[PDB]
Symmetry: D5
Subunit: 170 residues, 10 copies
């Protein structure tokens, strides 16, 4: 059952990620101090263009300049993530990417987030906005066919940051 | 415990809504054949301006022209709902509005949609997109401070409708 | 399930009440050393004339001069209560009032007093007389359509105070 | 546990009453088609004057002209009810009375109405208003030292009858 | 369920009795150091003449000269016990009596002794013989229409006392 | 646990009894249409003089002439009962007797009548008056050291028969 | 349920026995240091001759000379036991006997040894050999008709004692 | 738990036996019509002389002439039984034998008879006399060191046969 | 908990496999009437040379000349399987292969065969020989560092088919 | 239920084995610090030639030159194991052997290793490679008709020790 609740500490996670083409151990707690956009995508190497992970990567500075990091996660292995990264974009690969790719091979992370699909063995499109004190502020769940918008995510982040500081004015 | 699941029938509801300044029984199944934007807001008559309900209200034809209805919901009674509509925007009301205000006084619907706050007694900002077959496609949950964007809700509705046809 | 039992400590409650147009946290224990008439009413902003709430506020000194306070309560938010007070009596509103309007938005207080209606999501008309030691002396429960009497409530209070002191 | 709940069928009862000096079997359903004021008092033959039973007695035709009956109950045996009635008022008795005294010897009725005091073996003073279709409309429970009022009871009954017929009005 | 068992401590009781026309608190343990004939009868103020309470009354000094007390009990309130005593015999009353009438208003005592009739709310006629150390020596239960006998009771008590002292002999 | 309850069917029993020096199966239902005094005694062959059993047998006609039978019972085997009858009264034995001695060797009958002593493995002195319709009217239980009276038992029986017919 | 198991401590018992025509408390632990033959028989005073008890009685020194005692047991009371001993063999008694007769009136011991017959209320023909350390070595259970042989019981006792020393 | 009860149908068994040096399937029901002596012994091939199985074999006609058969059982496999039989007696083997050797490899039979030893994985010395209607008449259990006597078994069989016919006379 | 049990039918499985570069739906029963070597390997794209899968592919004809198929499986998706087949060996891919690569993305197959490593989220090295009637004949489980042998697998398959005929 | 799990310590076992013609008490931990090939075979004295046990015995030095011991086990008693070793091969015995034959007479070892056939009462053909730290590294289960290979077992042992060093 899902552990993700708005207003509660986002469920702890840790696992191996690909970070600049190397295997690094990564933990939710590594992000304390900053806002974190933590999103799940269904699988590496499919025949859909990975335009949403690419979008977040390409516009990463828009998050980093407002104290926000981005982490992406699927149930693939770190070895698969690596291979997808080292596959040229023009070839359906992801190409180089500046956002970590977290592996959830055991499926524990996805279950903890309520994004796992029992019958498919992968996640749906799930996005989580977690604040600098590690509290969960926002949950977005999309049925598989529909992607997330970087612009919408940015709006939400800036809005949580505004109201953390100033309250709701009006 | 929450019955709302992506890809499954959105969980059934019925209640009283204020529609065009009158009480009506409104059911989920009323919307079968149309996409539905179904969203919850925390309370009537607070000191925060109802910006999001007004935007969905004013830009309603935009959803109607792509075969979509909108329904807003909170735990307030339908009487409070009618009073808030009858209060002029100037003095802190909503003023006339083109979207039904559903009353979830019993809390059952909020509970069924997983948006209910046990400690507070009202909901968080929860939004749900329900297809013309009554299937839940999308769940958006915000912590109280932050509201919803019509543009985003537009984009998503169009994207679900696009891929229904073309995948 | 109900905790209210004659001759036992009235069940504890606390919450946000509208007192003289401000939000204030209010606890049952604020009333120690005084009698308290504690009563539930079903909803703000209905079409029923609120004559029974108005009568308790308007005759509040009849209670204060025999060491009794009065607190009213419904499942409505404090925001709704405040908006109801800010609506003039001539318009269906409550107008200014001298009694706290306590909010039971989570429903807990109503469930503890056994006055909550699961099917409706609000209370019936329930009244509780609590003594200065916080013991419950009298429970009055009415079906929706019929309200309470300040005269009867005064008789009960004077009688408990007379038998508390005499035979 | 109590089965008395507003706007549900008043809990069924039956038992022996003293009616005009005779034992009669009496049932809640005997009263269908009229309003019923059903009330409990603590005991016969105590040293408290029975002002309130007498008052309802003295004023019965006020209830009857509005299609309403009154029944009193305690946990005393019907034999005690009878002796009490047969004892002159001037000697701590009740004397002649026009209302049925129902006996709740088994205590079941008291329990069902939630008026029963486990530690004492008798009831507190409870009063119940049941409509013509057996639905419970009103519950009044007083701690032991404070009695009921015919006037208040009449008001409630007339208001229930008035609203049954005309709904809620100003 | 009954707690009365031969050769075990008679089940504890306490309650209000009428003793020489006054309310007294009375406890089983008040009787330690003597034999006790403890007996239950069905109700006060019925139309059956109270031959048996009167008989034990009339003959009390026979029990007392052998270090033995008698207590009567029904489920009636002590207020009823008192009114019954205060009602002249010639009017269905008991008149003056020399034995304590214990009240079992809560029904707990009746239940503990297994004399309680759930369907009637009162007791059948049971009689119990408790020795000087609180141990139950004898249980007699009669169906409602048949009374007890002082003579038999005296015989039993004298035989218990005789065998306590001299054991079993011929 | 005990099945014996005043105003209910006496509990069923059956077993081997010694009747006029022969083994015979005996059932409670053999007694329908007659009163039955059914009684337990602790053990055969003890040093207590068996005066109470002897008295019921010796005064058996006092019961038979008011339509009453008597059956005695203990946990002893029928073989032991028979040997006890075959021992002369002058030697501690029972001598010939006119009442069945019923054997409760398995203990079931005693447990059903609530007269069995777990610590001892035998009964106390228990007596049961059963009417002609097989309803239990009277239970008498004595501690070991003290026996029953035929006179008292006769009074009880005559009284049940008198109130069965009259007031 | 049966506690008797080969190789484990034989299950503890105590009760009253008739030993040399008097009542004595007899305990299993009384026999510690000696082998014990512990056997049950169905009932006293039956019409079958007590051949087996008499044989064990008469040939007792044979066990005593190899450090063995014998104890017989049935569900009869110790009073029946004493009466059966006091009845002359001629008339169906046992006559004087050199072996204790244990009484298992409560049935606990029979139950503990698995020899009790629930339907009958007495035991079958059960025999047990218990070593000087209180360990059960041998269990012999016969259906009612058939009795035990002293010679066999002798052989077994000697065989256990032989292998205790030499294996 | 053991299923063997005196006076009840002896627990059903079946398994492979060695019968005249061949593997035959054998069942308790094969013996209906006759008395059966069914005994367990601890193991094939030990360093104890198998003098008790040999004894029963050697004197088999003493059973067969009074309508009685004999079956022996251990937890060894039928292959081991065969090999023990084909091992010359003078060599610690059993030699040829006219009594079937039943294998209880799964231990079910021994458990059903209450003769199994959990801690050893074999049986103790157990003997069962089962009559011609398949009822169990006799149980003999010996601690491992001590054997059974053919003479005693014969006595028991003849005695059950006598009393089946004539009752217990006396 | 594992369902794979020798002499029992092999646990049913189904899923997507890559066969000759294409997604095909594959199930255990597609193999009824042939023997099946079903093996698990830990993951696609690791840095360990894939010698064992290549070895079976190269030697497929030896299996097929004896009525035997080979199927490999890991917890990686069919998509990853395709990408690995499509990556030239010299770059750590598998290259073209003649053996179906089954995907166990839900992990249900691995669990059913008892090869799943709950801590790592992938299988160990498991191999199963399933006969032409669906019956599991052989189970081989290796700790991760050590591979399987084609020669040993052939020996086993031939021995099973040899004994199916000749005993 | 089986306790054998790869990468976990092998299930503890102890029992009597025949070693060099003698009963010796043997346990898993006697092997700590060496690798152990532990295998099960179905029964002593069957008509099937015992080729696999002989083969390992003949080739023991190959195992011992690489710090490895071999132990065989079946559910037969140590006594049967001795008789089988003591029976000349030409008569279907095993003849002299260099490998301990462990007895699993209680069946607890076979169960713990998950090789026990509850319907037959003996094991199937199971082989276990346990490393020098007591950890289970490899499990091989064969259906009864098919034996193990020494060459394949050597290959596995060498591969495990090779990877323990060099990865």
């Amino acid at each position: 059952l899902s552990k993700a609740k708005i207003s509660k500490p986002a469920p702890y996670w840790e696992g191996t990620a690909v970070i600049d083409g190397e295997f690094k151990e990564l933990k939710l707690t590594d992000y304390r101090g900053k806002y974190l956009v933590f999103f799940f995508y269904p699988l590496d190497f499919t025949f859909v263009c990975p335009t949403e992970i690419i979008a977040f990567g390409d516009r990463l500075e828009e998050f980093r300049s407002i104290n926000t990091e981005v982490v992406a996660c699927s149930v693939d292995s770190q070895f698969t993530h690596l291979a997808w990264i080292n596959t040229p974009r023009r070839q359906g690969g992801l190409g180089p990417i500046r956002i970590p790719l977290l592996s959830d091979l055991t499926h524990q992370i996805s279950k903890d987030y309520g994004v796992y699909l029992e019958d498919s063995g992968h996640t749906l499109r799930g996005l989580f906005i977690i604040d600098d004190k590690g509290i969960l502020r926002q949950i977005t769940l999309n049925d598989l066919p529909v992607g997330r918008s970087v612009d919408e995510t940015l709006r939400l982040v800036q809005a949580f940051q505004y109201t953390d500081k100033h309250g709701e004015v009006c």
